[PDB]
Point group: C3
Chain length 234, copies 3
């Protein structure tokens, strides 16, 4: 996250850090708890991941320093990537992780509500342990930044070489300065409406990070609520 600040412990209890253990353990992406056995994240996080055996999901984390070899984690039983996904910039950048065990909800870890088709937001935040600038490194403390949504027409003007579809949502300041970046991929764009937090977007792509006239692009979660229901069925 560029231009953000440190989060308060437990203020984004749906946020997870997804690690890979290959070659050595490191944070790979963000994600969101949406159900007792389910994390919603970005499909592009799984480039080159041939097996879910190398993944670990950590919930209830503020600082990456909390994660040691003796820290509990959730194993991943299955990676479900949208069957129309090819690459972040062409959309469908959404994936589910089915966990091996169920999350026990607590003040530190609980699910975020999915947006309602009926709500198709002025208090939106992007969170993560990603870079603070394009060439940087993973941050210890979960960062947060408040960013305004921009219309799809506005976003399209900023990305003339792309097709900004109704299955994408954009957020950014005209002058830049606050945005998601590498490593924030897969995490939430969370919006508070009528005192309830909604998972409105999934961090997906953008040209650089926090540049002027280059909003962040996110998967528009409401366009996938039918897909999420279909894929999370027994």
């Amino acid at each position: 996250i560029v231009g953000g600040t440190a989060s308060v412990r437990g203020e984004w209890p749906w946020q997870v850090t997804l690690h890979t253990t290959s070659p050595t353990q490191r944070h790979l992406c963000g994600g969101s708890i949406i159900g007792n056995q389910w994390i919603l994240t970005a499909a592009h996080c799984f480039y080159g991941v041939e097996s879910p055996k190398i993944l670990r999901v950590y919930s209830g984390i503020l600082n990456q320093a909390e994660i040691a070899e003796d820290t509990s984690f959730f194993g991943v039983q299955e990676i479900i990537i949208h069957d129309q996904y090819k690459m972040a910039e062409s959309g469908y950048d959404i994936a589910l992780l089915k966990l091996e065990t169920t999350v026990n909800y607590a003040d530190s870890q609980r699910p975020i509500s999915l947006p309602s088709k009926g709500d198709r937001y002025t208090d939106c935040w992007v969170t993560g342990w990603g870079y603070r600038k394009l060439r940087d490194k993973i941050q210890n403390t979960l960062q947060k930044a408040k960013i305004p949504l921009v219309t799809n027409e506005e976003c399209q003007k900023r990305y003339r070489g792309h097709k900004i579809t109704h299955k994408m949502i954009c957020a950014g300041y005209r002058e830049g300065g606050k945005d998601a970046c590498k490593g924030d991929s897969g995490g939430p764009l969370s919006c508070k409406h009528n005192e309830v937090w909604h998972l409105v977007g999934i961090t997906s792509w953008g040209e650089g990070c926090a540049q002027r006239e280059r909003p962040g692009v996110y998967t528009n979660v409401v366009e996938y609520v039918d897909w999420i229901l279909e894929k999370t069925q027994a």
Copy 2:
């Protein structure tokens, strides 16, 4: 219906009583007229029904005592159950009855409008001839009860062993006392908005009837308007 009152004759002209003639004739479920040849109802009503030949639809009824062997009815040519339906509690609880003859609309019998995707309600009523308590019997006079809708987040808290999906809608009072019950299955949850009645829900399931902190669960009809259009085509 628990905690309801007798309806005025003709005030719910889309409501039908669906009877089975097997082994002897009795009310089986409610339904709603949505087209000249079409009744919308719940799929769970058809457990063990192997043929539409045993069904009779009666329109324009207030009291079951109006139904005698000499009373006119509509035969059922076809039962169309949603192909994803398995059981009420897992959703897709929706079915169409294609009638053998067409309904001639009148002050006693006319169709209810389907909800618009654009309207994704404070004046909602559930109606039927079902039980007044869990272990009871079919009622003579069509009953009505005004019940507030509850959010899907609220409903989910009341049914922790279920998945309350966006394809379901819930309605009930926190203290209970008014609800649908056995025998109301398949009937409408009708909401009046901008002076027009909309078929918002279909009576589907609930734990007990009218219990405290146990809202009634209904099929969210707006999530099926595309299915209804597809299935009612020639």
Copy 3:
């Protein structure tokens, strides 16, 4: 267009005139620029069209007199008709034309935004070079008429022999007098909302033109945004 007035040059820069060259060149239908290589129009325009080789799309036109044998046009590489389309009156009346070359946007020719599912209008206009009455001829100057939308319930009362679905939108005055007509087929029903023009409808059918109690029927474009995205993908 019945009861309209001449347009100002460039005030509907998404409007195109689609011509056929067979047997001799003439205006066939209207359409709307929605992308650099894409025109959205009505499927019924292509009755008897066996090849896209006979089509020519002209952009930036006010008067048909501007079109001469030396006027530039866009060739059509492919006609994509909705696979559920059979006839205008039963819906799915939508088609895409993939152009052979891309449109270079200018003050005279630019795309209209598609409606958002979130916007599911009081300033709606229908435009075209069609007839001014049922038995007439193509008009030289692009005509415009402001027409109010009517609800689908109201529209259904006016077309009792048809099924007015949620995939259709109607517009008209109770007393008639302003409407689209033959030759306006395929053109836009454009609505201005929050200072942005949205392509809300595609001119499709109606009984006569501008008759009392016979609104114009249009394809409800918002119900096709997923189809448009699917079909315009590489």
